[PDB]
A paper describes a structure:
The structural alignments using PDBeFold showed that NCTD in our refined NΔ230−P68 structure was similar to that in the N−RNA complex (RMSD = 0.84 Å), while the NNTD exhibited some differences with residues from 35 to 103 and from 189 to 200 being out-of-register in the structural alignment despite an RMSD of 0.95 Å. An analysis of the original electron density map of the N−RNA complex revealed that the absence of density for residues from 105 to 118 and 185 to 188 and the low resolution of density had resulted in the incorrect positioning of the latter region relative the remaining NNTD (see below). For NΔ230−P68, the C-terminal part of P68 (res from 42 to 68 + tag) remained flexible and sampled a wide range of conformations, consistent with the SAXS-based ensemble analysis. In the MD simulations of the N3−RNA system, the C-terminal domains remained stable as previously found, but the N-terminal domains started to unfold in the first 100 ns of the simulation, reflecting possible packing defects due to the incorrect construction of the protein segment from residue from 135 to 200 (see above). We thus re-refined the N11−RNA model against the original dataset using more recent software and the model of N extracted from the NΔ230−P68 structure (built from higher resolution data), which yielded an improved model of the circular undecameric N−RNA complex. Using three adjacent N subunits (N3−RNA) from the re-refined N−RNA complex structure, the MD simulations showed that the N protein structure was stable over several hundred ns in multiple independent trajectories. The first crystal structures of polymeric, circular N−RNA complexes revealed that the RNA molecule was embedded in its protein shell, with some bases facing the protein away from the solvent. This directly suggested that the N protein must open and close, with the NNTD and NCTD moving relative to each other by rotation around a hinge located in their connecting region. The binding of RNA, NNT-ARM, and also NCT-ARM blocks N in a close conformation that shields the RNA from the solvent, cellular proteins, and the viral polymerase.
Author numbering:
A (entry chain G): 351 to 372, 398 to 400
B (entry chain H), C (entry chain I): 6 to 372, 398 to 448
The structure:
Amino acid sequence: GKGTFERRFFRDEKELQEYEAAETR
Amino acid sequence: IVFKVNNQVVSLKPEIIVDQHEYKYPAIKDLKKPCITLGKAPDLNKAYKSVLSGMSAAKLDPDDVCSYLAAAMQFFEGTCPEDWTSYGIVIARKGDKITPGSLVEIKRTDVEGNWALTGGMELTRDPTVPEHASLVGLLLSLYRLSKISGQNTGNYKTNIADRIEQIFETAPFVKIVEHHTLMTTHKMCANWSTIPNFRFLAGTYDMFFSRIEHLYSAIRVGTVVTAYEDCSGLVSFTGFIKQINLTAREAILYFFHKNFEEEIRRMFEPGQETAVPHSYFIHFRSLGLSGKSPYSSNAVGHVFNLIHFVGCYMGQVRSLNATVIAACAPHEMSVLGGYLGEEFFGKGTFERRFFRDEKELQEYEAAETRSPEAVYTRIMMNGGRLKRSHIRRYVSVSSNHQARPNSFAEFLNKTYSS
Amino acid sequence: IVFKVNNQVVSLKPEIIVDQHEYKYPAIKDLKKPCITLGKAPDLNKAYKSVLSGMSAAKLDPDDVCSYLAAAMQFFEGTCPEDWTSYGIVIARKGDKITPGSLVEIKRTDVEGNWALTGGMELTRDPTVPEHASLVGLLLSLYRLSKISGQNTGNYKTNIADRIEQIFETAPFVKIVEHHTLMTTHKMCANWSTIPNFRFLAGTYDMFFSRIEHLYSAIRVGTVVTAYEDCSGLVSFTGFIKQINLTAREAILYFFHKNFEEEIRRMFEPGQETAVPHSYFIHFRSLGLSGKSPYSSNAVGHVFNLIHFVGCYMGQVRSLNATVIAACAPHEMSVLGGYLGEEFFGKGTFERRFFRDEKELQEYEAAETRSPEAVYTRIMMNGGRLKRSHIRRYVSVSSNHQARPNSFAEFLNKTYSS
């Protein structure tokens, strides 16, 4: 019932970099 | 990569497991039409006579049937409505008459065919073109019949066969094979899908009749299966896009896992004429350049599982009866599917698009939230764990629907029983 | 459009999905009446013996049947009540006698028909015009019997056939085919609806009997289906307008989604005689000048789905039993339908219109809210999400109904069930 989820797909490279700037398995 | 344990000293054993993945993509760089090897050309009339008796006789000859189909390709021809651009090949141009014989290259050997007939044919005269079309369509339906198989397919495999006979017993086709001969011949020839030349020919027929409207286009009922062969993953994704009412791009944004990366790349190779309306691509698994399909439900297993887990959350029966790809981490996919399903079930993005007058549009132009970011944060707040409501919804959908053995529904029932 | 994603690189991939259609509109710019080519005109009496024998024997030749129907068009003649202009062509002048033979252009080739005797015909004398009209009606009725084929039913097709037999066995028609022959011959002619010339003739007869009252106008019992054929989307929209008690324009304002734009534009393309009472448009699909119809339920799938989701919310049986267009974002349509149905269910716009005196009418000059803006803002307040009452209502309607296979009732049951 648990998954390790992270945003992987973005419209922009800049968007990707911002997400990189941003209970545990 | 090596991970180490100590017995008396440090051991540093490496971990090795088999996970080979080789997928060939469909593209014509040599500019060569698909090629298969065939037998000696028979006399059209004699070939029709032999195959009709053989079919009535429940006698299956692979070489004879395919050779007959190749000869019959000359009967069906039409002018191309518009210029046809494929994988560097342009066999059809607007105002140019085309045939199945022109679309692919068939290698004919002078080796004589057996053209042997058990019997049951009383026709003493040369066949008409419709009779030829009726027989041609029946064989292609044998191919579709072979694909059926399954379990608990009683009164369904019979039903599809009945539909086929009905088409070819009514105009423009003429009844040549009485009734239930096609069903009983299929019992004799259930695994004919395996034969490559039979499959290739069915694909050629389906491509020509789909491109050109014809009097005998109904033969496509047998050859419809050839379209998007072994591409259910790509097909499921396109359907997922339409059911969810998103653009392909926005749809992929919601895929919050590393495993999707390989699959997204796999299904969107550069070029590949996926977007092209009429192309070799639709029938790449048939014909040639098949390889193993990188678009199959297995090749794109994580995306496939997520799509249908989302579908089950929304009560899509298609997803409920799809067979889950067990290898591709179904549990994690169901959790992401729960969050995606809750977001998309019962919710829509609405905006005023119609106005009485231009000034009203300008006023609206001068003037909880659905976004990937919002969903991701929601998942993070719950520590990447399903909400209890997700579990309830999943349980309610699986319990009311009848579960097939390897379906998503069965997995949902077994996984969450409370 | 654009993507950023890879295992360890920032790969940029444009995602490609295939979605193309044609949707050709009906229009006569050439000013030539619709035309079909067929064989040499037979002697009516001889042709009548052949097709009757064929009827009783359950074996019919499509080309021979079509030539007889085109030859029989001269029999039916009537005065035109008003001047008749369809598109650029003026088919007839007011007070001019006309036949079905004038409505379209019929071109006959010198080719001879088989007109062969297969089944029991007992007429030793020349047939009368009633016998001809009884047979013409019986032949055209096969078209309707062909179309109404589908899942389950059976009793429905059987009931329509016996009703058709009753019409042509009662005056002004004479019984020529005893009983139950129409149903049994239809089993052999089940797909005759596919035949283009047969469809063209049924549509021509229907268009003629629509405008011109005739003694044998009862033939329409078979050809009635051709009217607005394959235009269920447009018909559903007009019906949605009348039951909901709104004007065409005001109703479209309630369509708060981008998807509707393409469909609204498609179905309201100008220059097509949608508004004209007796235009070629009412039977365009049956005649030529069609292609695929842009007014079919699939063509306007989103509008169609919203119309019937509102109807289900309001308990309309027609909507409960319509087959949902799965491609056209049913879930989002169901949500908008829930809000719209809530607005229109149990509510009416009432005003005093009838008064005792003229002075009382003038007195009534000085004298919750139904508007697109109110509904849209109501939708926005709940974040585009169905209210709990919406789901209760949808479930109550779907469950207390015998859900048809792919009906809106079935979708509603599967989707909202807890």
